Paper text:
AiV-1 virions released their RNA rather abruptly at 53°C. Electron microscopy of AiV-1 virions heated to 53°C for 10 min identified 95% of empty capsids, which were used to reconstruct the empty particle to a resolution of 4.2 Å. The AiV-1 empty capsid is expanded by 7.6 Å in diameter relative to the native virus. The structure of the empty particle differs from that of the native virion, mostly in the contacts between the pentamers of capsid protein protomers. In the native AiV-1 virion, the interpentamer contacts are mediated by strand β2 of VP0, which interacts with β-strand F of VP3. However, in the empty particle residues 112 to 139, which form the β1 and β2 strands of VP0, are disordered. As a consequence, the interpentamer interface is reduced from 2,750 to 1,400 Å2. At the same time, residues 55 to 60 of VP0 became structured in the empty AiV-1 particle and residues 67 to 75 retain the same structure as in the native virions. Therefore, the N-terminal arm of AiV-1 VP0 does not appear to be externalized from the empty particle. The N-terminal arm of AiV-1 VP1 undergoes structural reorganization upon the formation of the empty particle. Residues 1 to 30 become disordered, and residues 31 to 35 refold into a new structure with the last resolved residue pointing toward the particle center.
Numbering used by the authors:
A (entry chain a), D (entry chain a): 31 to 235
B (entry chain b), F (entry chain b): 12 to 60, 67 to 75, 140 to 370
C (entry chain c), E (entry chain c): 1 to 223
G (entry chain c), H (entry chain c): 1 to 56
């Protein structure tokens, strides 16, 4: 038998990381990212890029307690629309290791695994996505001591060590006279979360 | 319960992934044939056990001295070539460096000698790592990046010979330090093995939570030496030569040296390094670090 | 066709809700072999079991008997801000229970002798003021010249089954279990030309019955 | 056999308290609570706070007939939106015993078990939630003779003796020139309702 | 995909409707042991079974035979506003049935003697005016010097199976069952220097067949 | 039917909580090992019958005289320490107070003497409860808060000794009152045991619905004494010392004292208190109430 | 989640359509005994079988 | 009737998502026999197995 008292969950990394948490936007670890309606944006799904980036409570701070991780990414995007007309967002999945186009066009993004999200007027619309572990590495490292390329130009990075890149293109049926920018918010969760080589927790006040 | 989320569970055949309803997609384990490597200590690499038709065909330290982690299980390798092993000439205990430990050093002071490197994570490493500006600094060195420090210390060893001749390597590491003090001496050093040393990781190793990393304490109250060993780690089954340091050694001070009066204000330390179970794949021309 | 009706809360995103995701990758992925990587962690309590320094308590030959060297309450104001790995796991969650393992490492000389009494007193409106008043609880008189480290167990002599991790109300009935303090039992002695002081490194980690539940925002807004 | 006449229900506290009833808002036991769109509000799920508060028929008055209660809370919120633009409400669950943030932000509330409710324009939107018995006490007391803390500052209260606190943050995609306030209405029901130590019913006219 | 169609009443909140809630807590909760707490109540009728004072009827030696000491109709105008625990349970619901247990506690002296006749008359357009007219119904002549309390059962001699609890229409055919009244049968007597008066405490509670159904807004807007 | 709602029912494994549909979440009973306590009378506390791998490891009154509630079942305690019991020196019938009962007192008049406390719920209690301003008031006292009144009455008893030395306690309570009147006296008192006495609870105990609480009536027509006993109650298995009064005694008047002419206009009453089955956990320094 | 699509005629009320009602009463009702009442009719043709004057 | 609730991402078109199409042809079609046509390819790797000049 057990008896048992079956040790409550919440202690298990498979359960703890299944819940959604606000992803810090690349750069300063900002809670939101603003991009124009003309070109769109490309948001990398790379841990190292998320932990630029020593935060405090940010999900990044929790992931920085492990050296290597391997899980199936769950991502929820929010597109805040400022103007008074409805729009449509084209979200395409570039696999980790794929060539990212310089000018994202509707035709080229259609060759990847894409989704066409209707966005409502004067409000934000939410949509959830599921991506399996597609990285060519055995485990995605959060920290890396070395160079990405043999020439040694990029230090402490592995572009392929990620779930890939998400390419966004806004679409409008009406023509606006003033160019406006969308606001983007991201949530991330993990399925079948596996972690290797623990690291010390980040400091606090 | 089974929390309110869905970790997997998974599906198949048309259960958790049909044209009527969906749950989160999950990746399966890739069952590959090949030579058994990756995990050091347990190498024993041997043979393993096109599939489509063509259109044109018909508590803790300094208690004992054991491995910081237990050795893991081997995995099938992607490359078909047979490895080259240095054997006892390579896998041996080498005198890595001799360094001084003075009482002026305070809590969390990383100690390193001539063969060591100044690495707090903030130093701009000029490629390749063999550049002299990386090892010679205005201040005292702090770390011993493996195998970079080991290969630099002994560039003529059989281990370094294959290291400069093969694109990838695979081995564990064992570090030992001997510090002899009389019964009247007091103080404690910590032997840290830091995986993928970066700016934040090295500074947290100096702090209170650093004991999450592999560690053994060299307390002068009882010990004169302390040993620590770690198995192989990396994002790939074999590490690229000259471009990746999986482990880095840190000998820092927990309790500042407290020598008896009228005696020297510093004790000498001897740092040893031991590569454990070494294999090298992909033989080609000589490209040093 | 089926007939349907929407309940209140349509289009609402939940962190704890399952089955919201739609597939953004068509093909079945196969992750490369990762059994060669050691030190695989699966639980947050394993971090708590690792040692973690909390206080560097000094001890000199000039210290007389009944001298307090350190004291801390067993409440989220202290146990959640020591800097040890266990303190980080506690701050992540809202409730804790079970025993806490304290380890006092004597980093003095092999010629030093003496005793330090480590006392654990359960919850009370006022902390213990003197050594003998603190020795009325669960204590252990520790002779430093034996094994290097002292294994002091902090028992979970608690009012309820769980203790709350609220930094704003640490002295609550359902929050603190009491105080743990270090007093000088027998003065530090040793031969002449030996060090006149000896540091004692206080570590803290989780006992074998230590648990935590109900996750909260980390970092905390504290103060 | 029975025969039977199986004594009609409605007499059983498990059945009687499963139905929803309007929760009195903390303060005066008001039927609604007004909060600005700038910061939001925090509504405690504490019986003692609900029975400030000797009412007449209020669900509080019914709960005051029992000393200790233990059940799984069901709560339905209503957010009345006065202005002409749609909005989104962020409702996060702070467990009983958790540290409640001073300034509720989107990032910090995302670490709790939260929900993102779309609110319609010029009307009220309703959403229902289910929270299990998460209190660290054996049974949540409706009345308490003592002090919460050892210092004896708060008399007759137990903050942990509750289902926790619900933290609200309004979100707007458009920018309004005049700051407006939301109106909040709450309904509460109970699953697996258990009660101990009966108390005399409240007086009436 | 399934085809669907919404019936009238989309997005409507119902107090009696199940399956509206969405999970606002992710993890499975475990409530602490509560078997040590006694007096666990599970039914509203258990409150009704507890005693409850309704009228403090005085009785002096000056009171002659055929003197009325009290009278109340068995209708939601009285039975729902006595202040007893049963009256609160009745006011919560819209219909009631079954027997009502009355208990007249004699709190006089041990030297007092006499008789008080307790009469229950079924429903009629006019209440009983005299003692003998009230004694034409179900009554019991109670000698006060025996046991302290009188166990008077109010039988459910009713027209229908259920009686409505409507305070606006108490004298309805489907509301009231009749009147219960206390008359002086034999005058209160006792030795000299004994108390000239004796109080009788009238309690009311639910019988073993008492039931209630169809919940209504409590408090009531009454008057 | 099975009302139209859903009480639980519950679910598991993926029945009432899957990624396709949801019902209301419910909490399960926590099965814990430990010492059997909480429920008084039935103490008999004895032993009971880590579970995860680490990364570094390989009708009514005054009829008879019985308990107001039946005694409940024991539960496993969270604390591992063995309790200290006062035994017969503690668990005994003590003379709590002697108070007068005059005829001037009307319906619902709470009677208490020198050892009693004025507590209608509106009094501002200055912490700690042992402050003299709590017990001395401008008007007459009304209640007997347990154990506050019992410990104050006998501060040198073995029960109070452990009470001031342990952080938590657990026991039932039995209160008895003797009022001797001749056969010519009339009147009735009610012995109330009020759980968690607060402003609204104490005022409803004076009123008609107060008989929901534990009660026995001391009617001078037949009785000279009346006894009432209650088992232990609290939100926790053990009550915090000096900071919580689970039970409070109230001796109030149902029928005003009606004495015979030419006799005294008041009768004397003697209130007794009996702690039933006492255990004390968490021994430390002396902290009085 | 299930995928769905609405056919033409959403939100339409039909006198002959079943399963439109939502519960406006929570508890299970019990009707009082009514077997004492005679002359229970169940069919419209029973009215037609009763006599009826048409022309004098 | 069933009760339902829409998850985020309603009306979104996915290249990898199945079961989006509705029938735009009523009758069951029968394709003419095509077993006479040789050189049937089924895999992209078969192209890769064919020779291809890279440098002269």
């Amino acid at each position: 038998d057990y008896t048992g008292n079956p040790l409550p969950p919440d202690t298990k990394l498979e359960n703890f990381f299944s819940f959604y948490r606000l992803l810090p936007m690349g750069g300063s670890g900002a809670p939101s990212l603003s991009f124009p309606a003309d070109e769109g944006t490309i948001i990398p799904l790379n841990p190292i890029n998320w932990l630029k980036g020593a935060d405090v409570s940010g999900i990044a701070a929790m992931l920085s307690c492990f050296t290597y991780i391997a899980a199936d990414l769950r991502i929820t995007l929010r597109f805040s629309n400022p103007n008074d007309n409805p729009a449509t967002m084209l979200v395409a999945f570039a696999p980790p290791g794929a060539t990212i186009p310089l000018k994202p066009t509707r035709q080229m993004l259609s060759n990847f695994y894409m989704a066409e999200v209707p966005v409502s007027a004067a409000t934000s619309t939410m949509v959830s996505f599921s991506i399996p572990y597609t990285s060519p590495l055995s485990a995605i490292p959060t920290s890396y001591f070395g160079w990405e390329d043999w020439s040694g130009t990029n230090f402490g990075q592995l572009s392929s060590g990620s779930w890939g890149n998400l390419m966004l293109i806004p679409s409008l049926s009406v023509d606006s006279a003033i160019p406006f920018d969308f606001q983007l918010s991201c949530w991330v969760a993990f399925g079948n979360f596996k972690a290797w080589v623990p690291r010390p927790p980040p400091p606090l006040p | 319960n089974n929390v309110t989320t869905d970790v997997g569970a998974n599906g198949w055949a048309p259960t958790v992934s049909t044209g009527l309803g969906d749950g989160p997609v999950s990746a399966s384990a890739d069952s590959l044939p090949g030579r058994s490597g990756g995990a050091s200590s347990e190498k024993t690499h041997t043979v393993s056990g096109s599939r489509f038709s063509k259109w044109w065909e018909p508590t803790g330290s300094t208690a004992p001295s054991l491995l910081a982690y237990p050795t893991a299980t081997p995995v099938p390798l992607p490359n078909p070539d047979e490895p080259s092993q240095p054997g006892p000439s390579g896998d041996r205990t080498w005198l890595l460096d001799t360094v001084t430990w003075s009482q002026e050093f305070t809590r969390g002071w990383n100690i390193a000698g001539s063969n060591g490197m100044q690495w707090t994570g903030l130093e701009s490493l000029i490629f390749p790592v063999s550049t002299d500006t990386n090892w010679t600094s205005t201040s005292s060195p702090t770390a011993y990046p493996l195998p970079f420090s080991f290969v630099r210390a002994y560039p003529d060893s059989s281990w370094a010979a294959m290291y400069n001749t093969h694109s990838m390597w695979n081995c564990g590491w064992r570090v030992q330090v001997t510090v002899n003090g009389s019964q009247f001496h007091a103080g404690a050093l910590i032997l840290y093995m830091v995986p993928e040393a970066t700016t934040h990781a090295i500074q947290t190793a100096r702090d209170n939570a650093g004991f999450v990393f592999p560690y053994v304490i060299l307390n002068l109250y009882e010990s004169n030496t302390a040993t620590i060993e770690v198995p192989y780690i990396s994002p790939t089954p074999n590490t690229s030569s000259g471009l990746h340091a999986p482990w880095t050694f840190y000998l820092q001070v927990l309790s500042p040296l407290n020598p008896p009066p009228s005696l020297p204000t510093s004790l000498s330390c001897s740092i040893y390094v031991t590569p454990v179970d070494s294999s090298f794949h992909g033989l080609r021309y000589l490209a040093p670090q | 066709h089926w007939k349907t009706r929407a309940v209140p809360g349509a289009g609402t995103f939940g962190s704890a809700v399952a089955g919201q995701e739609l597939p953004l990758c068509g093909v079945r992925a196969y992750y490369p072999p990762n059994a060669y990587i050691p030190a695989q962690v699966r639980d947050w309590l394993e971090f708590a079991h690792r040692p973690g320094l909390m206080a560097t308590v000094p001890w000199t030959m000039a210290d007389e008997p009944a001298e307090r060297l350190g004291i801390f309450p067993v409440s989220p104001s202290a146990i959640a801000g020591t800097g040890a790995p266990i303190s980080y796991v506690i701050s992540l969650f809202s409730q804790w229970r079970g025993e806490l393992a304290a380890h006092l490492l004597f980093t003095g000389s092999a010629q030093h002798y003496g005793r330090l009494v480590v006392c654990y007193t359960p919850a009370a409106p006022q902390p213990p003021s003197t050594m003998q008043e603190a020795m009325r609880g669960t204590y252990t008189v520790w002779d430093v010249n034996a094994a290097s480290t002292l294994e002091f167990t902090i028992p979970f002599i608690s009012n309820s089954y769980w203790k709350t991790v609220d930094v704003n109300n640490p002295d609550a009935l359902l929050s603190t279990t009491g105080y743990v303090s270090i007093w000088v039992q027998n003065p530090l002695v040793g031969p002449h030309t030996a060090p006149a002081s000896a540091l004692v490194q206080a570590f803290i980690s989780a006992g074998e019955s230590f648990n935590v539940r109900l996750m909260q925002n980390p970092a905390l807004t504290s103060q």
